[PDB]
Design a protein around this ligand. Structure first.
Ligand SMILES: O=S(=O)(c1ccccc1)N(CC(F)(F)F)c1ccc(C(O)(C(F)(F)F)C(F)(F)F)cc1
Length: 232
């Protein structure tokens, strides 16, 4: 059984988890102004997602207690990973679209029309598609978000032992939650760890998608820019 202390951390997380420039209508796909406006749209969707991800972290017990520079380094690393996680949650398997809202849905071709490469769009859609077979519930997603944020090995983490100590009760809760929910499915927890590793691959591919877009003269807005640009 889950201990009281685990049922409490899950509930806080779930409760905490409860808490634009228009697509260019009928513009040519080859059109450069249209490709810029599609990019700017996604960019603005993405800005609302870091906002909500930063507001969610502030509510994870311990996070605000951490070094200001560690907060930022933890948020820097995991933003794209958490966005990817959420995209998967919201994927419409009938329609083959990542949904942001409800009338805001995007196919592979939508992303291509914004100047993105198949090298990035294909693996994001495959990850979304493969997440349904895992059948995660609210609590499992939330636990996974919290463990993703408390990753001791991110670039520029100055207090990794503190970060790991904060992670452990969440990994431990997740383990026991999976054993309770699916006693017969002993591959479930390792599958969850496998997604974490996928997220680090897709975070890396996202980074080079951002770089290539710079070579096409497409610049991220300041807020996203400080998260994702490389510069020497
Ligand atoms: O799901 S996203 O976060 C997303 C962003 C905006 C609108 C809808 C969905 N996303 C796809 C992913 F699967 F990776 F999560 C996404 C994130 C970031 C980007 C970009 O960084 C930018 F600039 F558009 F925001 C880029 F296009 F450069 F890759 C594009 C798509």
């Amino acid at each position: 059984q889950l201990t009281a202390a685990q049922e409490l951390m899950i509930q806080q997380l779930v409760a905490a988890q409860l808490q634009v420039t228009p697509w260019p209508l009928g513009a040519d796909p080859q059109s450069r102004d249209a490709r810029q406006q599609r990019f700017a749209h996604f960019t603005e969707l993405a800005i609302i997602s870091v906002q909500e991800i930063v507001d969610f972290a502030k509510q994870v017990p311990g996070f605000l207690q951490l070094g200001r520079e560690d907060q930022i380094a933890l948020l820097k690393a995991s933003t794209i990973e958490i966005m990817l996680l959420e995209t998967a949650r919201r994927y419409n398997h009938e329609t083959e679209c990542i949904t942001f809202l409800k009338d805001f849905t995007y196919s592979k071709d939508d992303f291509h029309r914004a100047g993105l490469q198949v090298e990035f769009i294909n693996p994001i859609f495959e990850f979304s598609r493969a997440m349904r077979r895992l059948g995660l519930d609210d609590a499992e997603y939330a636990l996974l978000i919290a463990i993703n944020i408390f990753s001791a090995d991110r670039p520029n983490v100055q207090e990794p032992g503190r970060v790991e100590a904060l992670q452990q009760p969440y990994v431990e809760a997740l383990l026991s939650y999976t054993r309770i929910k699916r006693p017969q499915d002993q591959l479930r927890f390792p599958r969850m760890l496998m997604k974490l590793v996928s997220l680090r691959t897709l975070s890396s591919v996202h980074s080079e998608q951002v770089f290539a877009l710079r070579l096409q003269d497409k610049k991220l807005p300041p807020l996203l820019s400080e998260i994702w640009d490389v510069h020497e």
